[PDB]
Amino acid sequence: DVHPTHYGRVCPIETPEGPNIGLINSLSVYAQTNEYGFLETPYRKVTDGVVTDEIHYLSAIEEGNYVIAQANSNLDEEGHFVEDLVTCRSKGESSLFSRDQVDYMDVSTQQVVSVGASLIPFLEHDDANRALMGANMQRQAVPTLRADKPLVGTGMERAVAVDSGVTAVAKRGGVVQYVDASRIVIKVNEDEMYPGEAGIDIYNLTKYTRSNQNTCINQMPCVSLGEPVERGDVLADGPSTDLGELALGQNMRVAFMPWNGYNFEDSILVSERVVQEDRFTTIHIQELACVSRDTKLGPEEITADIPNVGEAALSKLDESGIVYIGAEVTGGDILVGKVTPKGETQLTPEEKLLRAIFGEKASDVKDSSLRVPNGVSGTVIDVQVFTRDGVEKDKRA
Amino acid sequence: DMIKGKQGRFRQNLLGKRVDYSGRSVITVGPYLRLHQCGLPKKMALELFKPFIYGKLELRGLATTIKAAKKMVEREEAVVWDILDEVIREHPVLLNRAPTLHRLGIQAFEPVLIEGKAIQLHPLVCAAYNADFDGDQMAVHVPLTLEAQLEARALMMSTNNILSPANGEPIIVPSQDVVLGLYYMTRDCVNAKGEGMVLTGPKEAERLYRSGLASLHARVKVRITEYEKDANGELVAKTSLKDTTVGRAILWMIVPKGLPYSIVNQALGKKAISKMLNTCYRILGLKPTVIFADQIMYTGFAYAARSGASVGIDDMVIPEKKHEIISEAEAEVAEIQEQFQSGLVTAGERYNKVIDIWAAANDRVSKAMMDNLQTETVINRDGQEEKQVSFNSIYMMADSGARGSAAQIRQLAGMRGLMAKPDGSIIETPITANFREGLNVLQYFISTHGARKGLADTALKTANSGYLTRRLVDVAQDLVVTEDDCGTHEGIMMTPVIEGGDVKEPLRDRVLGRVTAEDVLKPG
Amino acid sequence: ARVTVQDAVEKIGNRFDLVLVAARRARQMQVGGKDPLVPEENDKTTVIALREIEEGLINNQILDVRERQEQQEQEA
Amino acid sequence: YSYTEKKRIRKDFGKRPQVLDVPYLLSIQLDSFQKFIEQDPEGQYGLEAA
Amino acid sequence: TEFLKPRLVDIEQVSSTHAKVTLEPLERGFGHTLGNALRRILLSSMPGCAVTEVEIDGVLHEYSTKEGVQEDILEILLNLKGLAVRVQGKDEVILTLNKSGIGPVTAADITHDGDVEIVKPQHVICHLTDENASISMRIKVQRGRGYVPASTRIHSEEDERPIGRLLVDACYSPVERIAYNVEAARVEQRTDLDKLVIEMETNGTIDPEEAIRRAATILAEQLEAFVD
Amino acid sequence: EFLKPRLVDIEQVSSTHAKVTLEPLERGFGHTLGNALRRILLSSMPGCAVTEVEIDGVLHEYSTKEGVQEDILEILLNLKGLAVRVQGKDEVILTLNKSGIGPVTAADITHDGDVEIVKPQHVICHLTDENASISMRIKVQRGRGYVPASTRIHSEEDERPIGRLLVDACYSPVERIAYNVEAARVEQRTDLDKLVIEMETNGTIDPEEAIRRAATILAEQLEAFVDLRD
Amino acid sequence: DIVLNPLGVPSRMNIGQILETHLGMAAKGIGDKINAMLKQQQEVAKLREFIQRAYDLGADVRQKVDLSTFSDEEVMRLAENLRKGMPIATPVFDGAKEAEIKELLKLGDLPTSGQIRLYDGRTGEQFERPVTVGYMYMLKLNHLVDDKMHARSTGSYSLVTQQPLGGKAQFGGQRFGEMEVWALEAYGAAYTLQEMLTVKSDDVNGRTKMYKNIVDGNHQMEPGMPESFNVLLKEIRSLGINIELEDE
RNA sequence: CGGAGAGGUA
């Protein structure tokens, strides 16, 4: 359960719903660690009746001694409360205190949520539990075919997009000398140029690389030729990001009415138009790692000639036994022509009789090819070959 | 040690008894399936009945071997669709929820082959399954021998299992959507198009409403012919003129013969529809009951759709005097706390005083909100304004018992207010903000404590309930009714439980379903 | 087609030995030994046996005399 | 202001001026690892202390 | 392209009233569109013959019993709605229900005009007991479309008949039950097809199949000028 | 007794948007005919759409060409919105070849005499290099409704050519259909209504021919109901 | 695009999604107006003034307006990116009031209640009351239905405990846990327990012969001698303990 | 693949 000292240090409303709710918190937006290791929250210092823009990072125990006004205090002039009586918190409990007795102010109205929870709009209208499911489902969103900004947002989308590394941010300002689907080349401004000639700045963009959740991540160059850029702006939108704004899902037209019972509990009815627009359409990337092994019967070889297979399976492969990049395959088709040298030619008479009767090929090498697992399909987009020294570099390598 | 591992004899309990001829998939709602049907994806069926399909294919001569059957099914030719329709003509399937906490947790259905990739569960059964539609996945099994199939049909199917095996009473009650549709359609108004005329049975009620000439709601005299069970089981057709509403007659079309009209009048709530289904079961039987349930589901959904009952933000109503009552509450607590600093009240004293003040304020706010709801719509008859059941969608939304309660719609428009703090004690200052209005940062922070506490409580109670079910099953499982009568005139005194002045439960409820141990006499 | 078991419940009040006897009836018209006594609607043998027992055509006495019959022919 | 900003301004309804912008949201990891791997002229966290 | 036409319509009739007309297959979205257009045609506007104005032996009343019959005016008003009358001549014709003596006053007691047929042989409309055992109703049977309340006509006519001549609602539509359902069908790979099944019940003047087919003819002729 | 609805002025708000009105419509036919026509139009109208795309340089959907500012995926997603019509034959192969910098638009496509680009400012992609040149072959064919990426591959048993790009073909020429029933005044009788249909289409079908097609399909459907075969 | 059950709102308390719907309706209405003017090719001054009005909406809100941006090109691109609605930034506990949302609805020329009367495209009759329609930001969670379907009749077989397990080319069966056995037990369900434990779960010979019987065209199973029973019988017998098969 | 340890979901 949440102690009343988690205010502005960890998010009270974001935590997994499994057997470890409350054990796994998320850091607040403004929270940070002190040199010792205890957490602190920024707070505006209130001089006597003036709330200075100066910030002090009050510690967990430091918050206890002091009295802190709520982030919803209304301030005019140079930082004076419009209220002689202001909501405050001294030990974790609320109170109403004199405007000239407060010690500190919350720097922001949003300084008590995680980044996951901060994005939810109208958070002040949901159930705490329900908004907790909402925050936990924020994370589980998958990047759609296009990034679509949320028409109703919180304004932290830009901060999250920039701070996370999925966004190619312009390191040094300049004018974009070159834009392409893979590279961005910035002719850096001379005032930011270094002694000698550091010349241009090149941002190579990750394009269709498997994330750890098998979700495709790629970066779209949002800028165009000759567009001036300054330090700290977006050169290319990452996955689930549009114009430097975090774009988790997509905006749908919605009508709230129990249309012919197809919305019974929380079930949602979708228009065929959504499928037409290919929105909410997701790319997913699998990895099928085929490793050649060194065995006691012979070191395994990656070859394009596989026994006991037809020409159709071989027709998607190159001469090196690896499928073409860009071929449409389905569960069962051969990707990598792995064969294990069958150094053991002696077998039971049953096996020999079966292979003779069934008409299967008999060789001193056994098939080991990695076929597409049944249930997955798609198009091959990457082939990576890892070859340690001492092994010949084949054509694909 | 090989005698016993965990949890015992390995092959009769955990671990882990995974079984073939079964599947698992997320569930969607199909409001067109009849109560004995479940919508099952075509691929799921095709891979659940491959042996039966092979048998049929080689039976028709369409395949000469298992290899030909494999090719024939994998090529997805149009012929296998007829084969699968044949093997699924009436072959039922068993759906079980991932946790089965009561007997109904597994039930049979007739599978209807559907497009998609989710199991279309009957909407009215999901309440019995104690499931929802949130990504939770149901599991299908196929009782695949004849005798298992008949065990499924006679016992497993939801048609034969409609009452809870815990207290009797139907478990197949309309829950949230169809009940909203019925509550809307059976409501009355004080003035609408089509008011006052006389119509030849519900025939003309349907004809006139579906013309859009007469509103669904109108004080209308209709000559209805209702059937009553009398004598040794005969039906008497009593025809009389009844003061009803057009929608109520249209609904009366649903109810089969042999039921009174005392059920399909009045605004139908969830308890009212519970009563209707219970009476139908206890008066006609099961077949009229199942047909009535399916038809009333269809009609409730259809007229919920035609209603367009929608939830916005102007529908939820903020009482005009809520802030006034609040400000009175702060004035009172200010006086009390001034006495506290005056040393006039002890800590517990003013604590309880403030708690009572805020409870009274919450009660007043809820009363004002509900008073605003109950007659939010006022309509003239021929010049004078009249109250009547509010057209307000949020009022039907919970008054029908669709979803929510007076507490929940009380905490949306009015304050959810007082709640517990860490150490489980009530906060001095309630959550004075609604959800239609905003929540202050500290208010939401405080509210989060309760939600976290509830979620932890939920997880722990799920685990402990599983354990308790286990121990009780272990202690009770070796107990089977095996004799019809032992002649034991011994019994128990069995009385209506009454605490204080209030009778908590009626002896009428208890006595039902028991057998007397003596011959009861009259009280005189 | 009839998938509800109320008539079979009324005919056989136990409605549980009902399952066993209907299952046997289904078992031996599914495999040779007897043939359906009710017109087939492309139905599985389960429901044709159920419709047989609904009509009062199949009852415990009738089924047991019928089965003892097929034995005294199969020894003969 | 920002060039990316001026491309699509997302309208705000905030009514309290935001003193102190949102800090770098990975400051915890960067702070930890820089404290761990930097040089220390004294006994302070990192390889120097070890 | 190619279009899928829904051949092989099946029909199931109960008496000459209760028709279940099943048809398969209709393609996606066409089933319910056809159903709704048909029901609107059948309900809202079809030619028919119904009673418009009636004669009360005394003053017109809606809240008093019949003068000399222990049955109410409302119940005869309701019975005459269900009267199955088919006018083969000019539209607005007088019908005389003059029956004396005790017994159940039914359709047969009304005179026959020779162009006004009563396909309903027995339809109870009154019950005469010995108070005077005589009833004399002068009613108008007229042709119209759909359904017409009496209020609409009485407001539309500046001339009012003398008290005793009371305007009665007209059930012009020969079909009294109209309902339609669309259930999932299946043809080969596609399982998005839908069967359309329509349940209709007539007053008995015309066969339900004839009513629905002439309604379809009406709509097709409505579309005669828009088809190549 | 029943009059017959007649075509009256079919105004053109734009190429995409048009109003078609039917003046002499009897009582109880306004909303009925409106729903009829709207359902027919949104449900079943012939339309020309892109199905197969063959970009010279790239090997698959997710492989991005050098020189362009857009992924091949986004190029396909723009190709979906290509407003094209063919009326001389059912299936045609458009060809596009453009080099140099600038926005490659639909107008640059090498059009035949039987193919019309009713939206000749449709930005296909952006070429951002002088050396880079884009070479497209786009298959445009007639169809109805929506054909998601799962079916024509069964008409060929896998795409034997590699580098072929498969696109969800949305043949629906219309995107908005709305009907309004308004009290029409004419000397004949007293109660008749204008049926005014707003139709936003992709500019590839004439409103007159569209309504005619819808009516013909509806008449073919009502053929069975006029004459019940049993 | 989307129809949502209005039952989930008044019970699960998340009326925030309704406010999101209304505000998104207003935003997409502003987007529709700006898109219309783009198609109308209105003067750049018209776009500037309308956008300034839209951003100026609300009291005490600090967002600052043009003209500080470039006169034409930046304004043109801003409108072009805004033709699909105004992205609205709402601080979580410092956000928009209902009055401001309604003001945006007026500026969008759309109903002040966020409610406009639909017509059911199925029937084509307006619903008896107006309903709530807007724009909602929806997230496709990673729980995809393709990732959740798995079904089998045959396939992978394990050792020690004979039951379908492992692999994703054909994933194993469902854990027929003791709770399911108990649910069968509470019912008179007896046989289905026998198949789900004996003949289609563990015994390989029984599974093979029973699959053969089904392929033969008949749903066949014979109780006979339960194989697990025989195994446990021999197992106890090896303990020098004889198990008698006495019948009651 | 037999059973334990860990994250995530429901």
Curated annotation (Swiss-Prot), chain B:
<comment type="function">
    <text>DNA-dependent RNA polymerase (RNAP) catalyzes the transcription of DNA into RNA using the four ribonucleoside triphosphates as substrates.</text>
</comment>
<comment type="function">
    <text>Resistance to the antibiotics salinamide A, salinamide B, rifampicin, streptolydigin, CBR703, myxopyronin, and lipiarmycin can result from mutations in this protein.</text>
</comment>
<feature type="binding site">
    <location>
        <position position="486"/>
    </location>
    <ligand>
        <name>Zn(2+) 2</name>
    </ligand>
</feature>
<feature type="binding site">
    <location>
        <position position="136"/>
    </location>
    <ligand>
        <name>Mg(2+)</name>
    </ligand>
</feature>
<protein>
    <recommendedName>
        <fullName>DNA-directed RNA polymerase subunit beta'</fullName>
    </recommendedName>
</protein>
<comment type="subunit">
    <text>The RNAP catalytic core consists of 2 alpha, 1 beta, 1 beta' and 1 omega subunit. When a sigma factor is associated with the core the holoenzyme is formed, which can initiate transcription. The rRNA transcription and antitermination complex (rrnTAC) consists of RNAP, NusA, NusB, NusE (rpsJ), NusG, SubB, ribosomal protein S4, DNA and precursor rRNA; S4 is more flexible than other subunits.</text>
</comment>
<feature type="binding site">
    <location>
        <position position="132"/>
    </location>
    <ligand>
        <name>Mg(2+)</name>
    </ligand>
</feature>
<feature type="binding site">
    <location>
        <position position="134"/>
    </location>
    <ligand>
        <name>Mg(2+)</name>
    </ligand>
</feature>
<comment type="similarity">
    <text>Belongs to the RNA polymerase beta' chain family.</text>
</comment>
UniProtKB/Swiss-Prot annotation, chain C:
<comment type="function">
    <text>Promotes RNA polymerase (RNAP) assembly. Latches the N- and C-terminal regions of the beta' subunit thereby facilitating its interaction with the beta and alpha subunits.</text>
</comment>
<dbReference type="GO" id="GO:0008023">
    <property type="term" value="C:transcription elongation factor complex"/>
</dbReference>
<dbReference type="GO" id="GO:0006352">
    <property type="term" value="P:DNA-templated transcription initiation"/>
</dbReference>
<comment type="subunit">
    <text>The RNAP catalytic core consists of 2 alpha, 1 beta, 1 beta' and 1 omega subunit. When a sigma factor is associated with the core the holoenzyme is formed, which can initiate transcription. The rRNA transcription and antitermination complex (rrnTAC) consists of RNAP, NusA, NusB, NusE (rpsJ), NusG, SubB, ribosomal protein S4, DNA and precursor rRNA; S4 is more flexible than other subunits.</text>
</comment>
<keyword id="KW-0804">Transcription</keyword>
<dbReference type="GO" id="GO:0044780">
    <property type="term" value="P:bacterial-type flagellum assembly"/>
</dbReference>
<keyword id="KW-0548">Nucleotidyltransferase</keyword>
<dbReference type="GO" id="GO:0065003">
    <property type="term" value="P:protein-containing complex assembly"/>
</dbReference>
<dbReference type="GO" id="GO:0036460">
    <property type="term" value="P:cellular response to cell envelope stress"/>
</dbReference>
<keyword id="KW-0808">Transferase</keyword>
<dbReference type="GO" id="GO:0048870">
    <property type="term" value="P:cell motility"/>
</dbReference>
<protein>
    <recommendedName>
        <fullName>DNA-directed RNA polymerase subunit omega</fullName>
        <ecNumber>2.7.7.6</ecNumber>
    </recommendedName>
</protein>
UniProtKB/Swiss-Prot annotation, chain F:
<keyword id="KW-0548">Nucleotidyltransferase</keyword>
<dbReference type="GO" id="GO:0000345">
    <property type="term" value="C:cytosolic DNA-directed RNA polymerase complex"/>
</dbReference>
<keyword id="KW-0240">DNA-directed RNA polymerase</keyword>
<dbReference type="GO" id="GO:0032784">
    <property type="term" value="P:regulation of DNA-templated transcription elongation"/>
</dbReference>
<dbReference type="GO" id="GO:0003899">
    <property type="term" value="F:DNA-directed RNA polymerase activity"/>
</dbReference>
<dbReference type="GO" id="GO:0071973">
    <property type="term" value="P:bacterial-type flagellum-dependent cell motility"/>
</dbReference>
<protein>
    <recommendedName>
        <fullName>DNA-directed RNA polymerase subunit alpha</fullName>
        <ecNumber>2.7.7.6</ecNumber>
    </recommendedName>
</protein>
<dbReference type="GO" id="GO:0005737">
    <property type="term" value="C:cytoplasm"/>
</dbReference>
<dbReference type="GO" id="GO:0046983">
    <property type="term" value="F:protein dimerization activity"/>
</dbReference>
<feature type="region of interest" description="Required for interaction with Crp at class II promoters">
    <location>
        <begin position="156"/>
        <end position="159"/>
    </location>
</feature>
<keyword id="KW-0808">Transferase</keyword>
<keyword id="KW-0013">ADP-ribosylation</keyword>
Swiss-Prot record, chain G:
<comment type="subunit">
    <text>The RNAP catalytic core consists of 2 alpha, 1 beta, 1 beta' and 1 omega subunit. When a sigma factor is associated with the core the holoenzyme is formed, which can initiate transcription. The rRNA transcription and antitermination complex (rrnTAC) consists of RNAP, NusA, NusB, NusE (rpsJ), NusG, SubB, ribosomal protein S4, DNA and precursor rRNA; S4 is more flexible than other subunits. In pull-down experiments interacts with CedA.</text>
</comment>
<comment type="function">
    <text>DNA-dependent RNA polymerase (RNAP) catalyzes the transcription of DNA into RNA using the four ribonucleoside triphosphates as substrates.</text>
</comment>
<comment type="function">
    <text>Resistance to the antibiotics salinamide A, salinamide B, rifampicin, streptolydigin, CBR703, myxopyronin, and lipiarmycin can result from mutations in this protein.</text>
</comment>
<comment type="subunit">
    <text>(Microbial infection) Interacts (via flap domain) with Escherichia phage lambda antitermination protein Q; this interaction renders bacterial RNAP resistant to transcription pausing and allows it to read through termination signals.</text>
</comment>
<feature type="modified residue" description="N6-acetyllysine">
    <location>
        <position position="106"/>
    </location>
</feature>
<comment type="similarity">
    <text>Belongs to the RNA polymerase beta chain family.</text>
</comment>
<protein>
    <recommendedName>
        <fullName>DNA-directed RNA polymerase subunit beta</fullName>
    </recommendedName>
</protein>
